[PDB]
């Protein structure tokens, strides 16, 4: 394989992992419904269901997301075309992609299977996620958002613990980002106050979503009940804060900068990458893989 990955930073460990995924992907061509065997259900959301599947032609295990959409065939085909951009999204911080296709009322998005599942699933078992682990998560989320914005001009639009996947090799990756404008049009809140009120999507809204997700994972509960009451709280009341004493001053300041109500005052990705919480977390030696495997009983 003639790898053209010099544009990415990539330490030797990241380089080996990404080249291994891309090498395995070469066994995968055209994806069809009849070529899959369902193993088990990984999870489900409001929009779709995700199954752990065996792709019989390649022998690969993958995560197949099925989204029910029975619309005009021409615009369903525009969605499928837009999803093909996922073949160009190669980053240590973005879930690997095998392909996307339509069959009998369902759009299938086939991904790299992440054996640690999502952070909302690990939060259920952990109770609370330690601050040092959240430092590594924050670096991965910032780096993933920077990659999508810089290389592909795409905003995530759905940052939350269920969209941050982890694995037994200690990798942390984003999934379910808004690669398809047409799929967005055809389809607890983590939405920013400005997005709830009606404001054009900005990178700043993803930063708010990350801030709120970090607070939830740190305290072990959604930090903000009726639907109007909850949204009114987000829009019209001060943002939540981490409890003092139990968390470092750097982590408190980091989440506070993500959760500033005014998006122009709220930190941007460049500012977050050089914040004391990130500089401290990047220097820390944390065995994320060991912590993950022990917390959820993975090997
Ligand atoms: N590639 C994957 N590997 C392993 N588990 C996965 C993968 N993709 C998704 N899952 C799991 O499937 C669950 C359900 O996903 P999903 O249907 O996207 O619901 P959601 O994340 O809660 N909502 P949304 O992303 O907004 O549609 C996730 O939260 C993960 O735990
Ligand atoms: C391969 O990496 C992925 C990239 C994007 C997607 N998801 C979508 O584009 C479908 C939408 S995005 C918001 C809520 N979830 C959805 O159903 C899945 C994996
Ligand atoms: Mg999801």
Question: How is the secondary structure organized here?
Answer:
Blueprint: H1 12-25, E1 36-44, E2 48-55, E3 60-68, H2 73-83, E4 97-103, E5 106-112, H3 119-126, H4 131-152, E6 164-166, E7 172-174, H5 181-186, H6 193-197, H7 203-219, H8 227-236, H9 249-258, H10 269-273, H11 276-283, H12 288-296
Antiparallel strand pairs: 1-2, 2-3, 3-5, 4-5, 6-7
Helix pairs in contact: 4-7, 4-11, 7-9
The ligand COc1ccc(NC(=O)C[C@@H]2SCCNC2=O)cc1 binds at residues 47-48, 65, 67, 86, 95, 97, 109, 111, 158, 175-180, 183.
Describe it for me?
This protein is α+β, with helices and mostly antiparallel strands and 299 residues long. The chain has two domains: 12-111, Phosphorylase Kinase, domain 1; 117-296, Orthogonal Bundle (Transferase(Phosphotransferase), domain 1), CATH 1.10.510.10. Helix content is 42%, strand content 15%. It has twelve helices and seven strands. It has helices spanning 12-25, 73-83, 119-126, 131-152, 181-186, 193-197, 203-219, 227-236, 249-258, 269-273, 276-283, 288-296; strands at 36-44, 48-55, 60-68, 97-103, 106-112, 164-166, 172-174. A five-stranded antiparallel sheet has the order 1-2-3-5-4, sandwiched between helices. Helix 4 runs antiparallel to helix 7, helix 4 packs across helix 11 (276-283) and helix 7 (203-219) crosses helix 9. The chain binds phosphoaminophosphonic acid-adenylate ester, the ligand COc1ccc(NC(=O)C[C@@H]2SCCNC2=O)cc1 and magnesium ion. Magnesium ion binds at residues 45, 162-163, 175-176. It catalyses: L-seryl-[protein] + ATP = O-phospho-L-seryl-[protein] + ADP + H(+); L-threonyl-[protein] + ATP = O-phospho-L-threonyl-[protein] + ADP + H(+); L-tyrosyl-[protein] + ATP = O-phospho-L-tyrosyl-[protein] + ADP + H(+). Its EC number is 2.7.12.2. It comes from Homo sapiens (Human). ATP binds at residues 42-50, 65, 111-114, 118-121, 160-163, 176. Belongs to the protein kinase superfamily. STE Ser/Thr protein kinase family. MAP kinase kinase subfamily. It is classed as transferase.
């Amino acid at each position: 394989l003639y790898f053209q990955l010099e544009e990415l930073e990539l330490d030797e460990q990241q380089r080996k992992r990404l080249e291994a995924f891309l090498t395995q992907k070469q066994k995968v061509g055209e994806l069809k419904d009849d070529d899959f065997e369902k193993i088990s259900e990984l999870g489900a959301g409001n929009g779709g269901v995700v199954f752990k599947v065996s792709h019989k032609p390649s022998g690969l295990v993958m995560a197949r997301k099925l989204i029910h959409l029975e619309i005009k065939p021409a615009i369903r085909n525009q969605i499928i075309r837009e999803l093909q951009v996922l073949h160009e999204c190669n980053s240590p911080y973005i879930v690997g992609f095998y392909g996307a296709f339509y069959s009998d009322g369902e759009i299938s998005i086939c991904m790299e299977h992440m054996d640690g599942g999502s952070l909302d699933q690990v939060l259920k078992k952990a109770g609370r996620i330690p601050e040092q682990i959240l430092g590594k998560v924050s670096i991965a989320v910032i780096k993933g958002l920077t990659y999508l914005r810089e290389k592909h001009k795409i905003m995530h639009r759905d940052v939350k613990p269920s969209n941050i996947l982890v694995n037994s090799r200690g990798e942390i990756k984003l999934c379910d980002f808004g690669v398809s404008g047409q799929l967005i049009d055809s389809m607890r809140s983590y939405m920013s106050p400005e997005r709830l009120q009606g404001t054009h999507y900005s990178v700043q809204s993803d930063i708010w979503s990350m801030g709120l997700s970090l607070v939830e994972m740190a305290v072990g509960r959604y930090p903000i009940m009726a639907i109007f009451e909850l949204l009114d709280y987000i829009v019209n009341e001060p943002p939540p804060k981490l409890p003092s004493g139990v968390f470092s001053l750097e982590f408190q300041d980091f989440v506070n900068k993500c959760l500033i109500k005014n998006p122009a005052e709220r930190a941007d990705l460049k500012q977050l990458m050089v914040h004391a919480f990130i500089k401290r977390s990047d220097a820390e030696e944390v065995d994320f893989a060991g912590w993950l495997c022990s917390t959820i009983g993975l090997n």
